[PDB]
Amino acid sequence: KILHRLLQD
Amino acid sequence: HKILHRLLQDS
Amino acid sequence: SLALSLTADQMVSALLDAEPPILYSEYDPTRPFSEASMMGLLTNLADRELVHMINWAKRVPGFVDLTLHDQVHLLECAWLEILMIGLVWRSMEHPGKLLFAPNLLLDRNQGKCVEGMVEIFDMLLATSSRFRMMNLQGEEFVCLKSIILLNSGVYTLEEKDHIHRVLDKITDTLIHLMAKAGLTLQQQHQRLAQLLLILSHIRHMSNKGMEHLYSMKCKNVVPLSDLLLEMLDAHR
Amino acid sequence: SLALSLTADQMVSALLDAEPPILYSEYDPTRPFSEASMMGLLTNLADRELVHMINWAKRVPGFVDLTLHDQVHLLECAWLEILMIGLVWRSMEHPGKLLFAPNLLLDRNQGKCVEGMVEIFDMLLATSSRFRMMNLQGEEFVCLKSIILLNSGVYTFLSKSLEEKDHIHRVLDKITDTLIHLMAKAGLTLQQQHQRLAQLLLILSHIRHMSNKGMEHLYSMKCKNVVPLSDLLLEMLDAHRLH
Ligand SMILES: C[C@]12CC[C@@H]3c4ccc(O)cc4CC[C@H]3[C@@H]1[C@@H](O)[C@@H](O)[C@@H]2O
Ligand SMILES: C[C@]12CC[C@@H]3c4ccc(O)cc4CC[C@H]3[C@@H]1[C@@H](O)[C@@H](O)[C@@H]2O
Ligand SMILES: [Cl-]
């Protein structure tokens, strides 16, 4: 899930 | 003549 | 502008006095549930409650000062929020259940009976749990319900300013209740915020419930009363 | 928990300093608007703002304290409310118009070019006017925007019974304390403080309403293939469920 990824970066 | 109209006038 | 003259205590007594009756479902305990059948009970209930809500609204101080037009508008905007906050309040004492009526107390599983409803049931139960957590008081509850009536269509004038004057009085009343209850000033402001933030969630639930009721109306799962169709149509 | 130990003044500074930039749209004035091209400009803009929103959320005290699952849920719940409160803030000094970006300032007649949009434009305009009459201050705005982030998804933390998210509520209480501090320091009387706190929080119910109507409108545009949405926007939309 894209949001999940962006929250880590 | 919405029903709500009549109800507000009548209570 | 008599509502402006009321004292905190008189505001609370007025609202308590104005509370609608708790109505019964037509439900027969021995007979099992369907989807058309469940929606039939819920909507039959809502429709009878609506008639009493109108009488209640008229006893909310400041409401009768408004044009008939503005009164119609506030009730069209707020009615499902007001039914839901009543529901949540009645259920505070039944963790995990919704007391739609004394003879119709539904678990969340009983909400799976109606397509798409379980998600809204979950939100209603969560609100009930939050009220329980906060130990919401009856006096606070009636202030919140009046705030919903007057706030939910004030952005949809001398009229506007009156409504906001009245809203400020109900705010004064909540704070009065909390100070009377012994809360510190800091605690009063915090609790007031917690309570008003819950109205945001009740607005959210009303929105979802309104689109759910419309989906039932179309699918023809249930015949709705003229008044309900009218209250439903104002949202489109 | 760092957030909990912040002072009012420190709370305000973090929020003010976490503010995202004002972005530009790709508006091209050589061309007239269509339904499709207007929706395109607006969603292209929203999509770019989301990346900045995620970074901003990470800087809201207490936000980084939650699981990724919790952060995801909050932003999924609040993202459109947050774009909207930002839009109405930028628009305050432009009575009658919505400043989506510095190169994209639209009045309601322009909003008519998209089916079903003008009704939401009208609510947004009215909210901007309400902020203008209340004389909303930037310090107060940043507090409301954080309250939206932390609050909007909080009563959908179902375990399916409501989880006790005291952490979030503790943080929300601190932002209440901060709003009150700002009002006191602004010279308001004790009664005025609680009255204004109430007026500001009631507006959040209206922003929730506008978000729900805009999410429905956006879903409609997708289901009519009016505009291709980014995968992020598709996922954020899908988080809400519409039919
Ligand atoms: C509108 C509704 C049927 C009537 C329900 C009712 C009936 C009586 C009542 O007191 C409160 C409520 C609050 C919940 C109401 C349901 C919504 O959640 C929708 O999902 C569904 O279509
Ligand atoms: C979702 C949306 C497109 C993006 C818009 C936007 C873009 C950027 C922005 O900063 C704020 C907003 C706030 C309003 C957002 C529109 C809603 O009114 C819907 O009607 C329409 O589908
Ligand atoms: Cl009856």
In the 3-class helix/strand/coil scheme, how is chain C assigned residue by residue? CHHHCCCHHHHHHHHHHCCCCCCCCCCCCCCCCCHHHHHHHHHHHHHHHHHHHHHHHHHCCCHHHCCHHHHHHHHHHHHHHHHHHHHHHHHCCCCCEEEEECCEEEEHHHHCCCCCCHHHHHHHHHHHHHHHHHCCCHHHHHHHHHHHHHHCCCCCCHHHHHHHHHHHHHHHHHHHHHHHCCCCHHHHHHHHHHHHHHHHHHHHHHHHHHHHHHHHHHHCCCCCCHHHHHHHHCCC
8 Å CB contact between A4 and D72:
yes
In A, residues 1-9, which contact D (CB 8 Å cutoff)?
1-4, 6-8
Q: Is the CB of D43 under 6 A from ligand 2?
A: yes
Using a CB-CB cut-off of 8 Å, the residues of chain A touching D75 are 3, 7
| Ligand 2 mutation target, pool D80, D211, D216, most atoms within 8 A of CB | D80
Method for this entry = X-ray
Nearest to D212 by CA among D81, D124, D109: D81
Domain boundaries, position C3: 1-236
CATH number where D183 lies = 1.10.565.10
The total of structural domains in chain C comes to: 1
* Nearest Cα residue in chain B from C66: B8
- Taking the CB of residue D9, how many other CB atoms lie within 10 A of it? 11
Instruction: Give the integer Cα–Cα distance in Å for D215 and D241.
Output: 9
Tell how far the Cα of C146 is from the centroid of ligand 1, in angstroms: 19
Resolution in A: 1.9
Residue D49 annotated as lining a ligand binding site: yes
- Bridge pairing between strands D104-107 and D97-101: antiparallel
